[PDB]
């Protein structure tokens, strides 16, 4: 409600009352979580054209003799098809020798 956004301050002159911006229309606290998630169409479409830059950069890094620059990856750090954070994670070489996490997680319900 627009009648629950009033705050007062008594600092120098007196108790000055003010109101939050609600004169346009009714208030809407959470419009939708769906509009903040980058849904599957946008996610898959963007992340499809993400690794291609990583392979043009990995190819560029191997041709130019450059290392994995986190600054160059900051533009392709968003999500990846899988997490890009796992690509440059701390256990990258210690977690890569384990295949089948989805099946192990699925039957965890029965464990």
């Amino acid at each position: 409600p627009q009648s629950d956004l009033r705050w007062s301050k008594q600092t120098d002159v007196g108790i000055t009352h003010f109101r939050s911006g609600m004169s346009h229309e009714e208030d809407q606290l959470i419009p939708n979580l769906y509009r903040y998630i980058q849904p599957w169409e946008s996610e898959f479409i963007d992340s499809q054209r993400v690794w291609a830059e990583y392979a043009l950069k990995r190819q560029e890094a191997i041709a130019q003799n450059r290392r994995l620059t986190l600054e160059d990856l900051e533009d392709s750090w968003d999500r990846g098809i899988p997490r890009i954070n796992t690509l440059f994670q701390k256990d990258r070489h210690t977690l890569a020798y384990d295949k089948g996490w989805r099946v192990r997680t699925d039957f965890k319900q029965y464990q």
Partner: peptide
């Protein structure tokens, strides 16, 4: 009644666990 009561999802007469009545004058 300050709200529009049209942007709401389907309808909201009274959310007070007492909606015995059912009418809007649609017919």
């Amino acid at each position: 009644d300050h709200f529009n009561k049209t942007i709401l999802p389907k309808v909201m007469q009274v959310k007070n666990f007492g909606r015995s009545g059912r009418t809007k004058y649609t017919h």
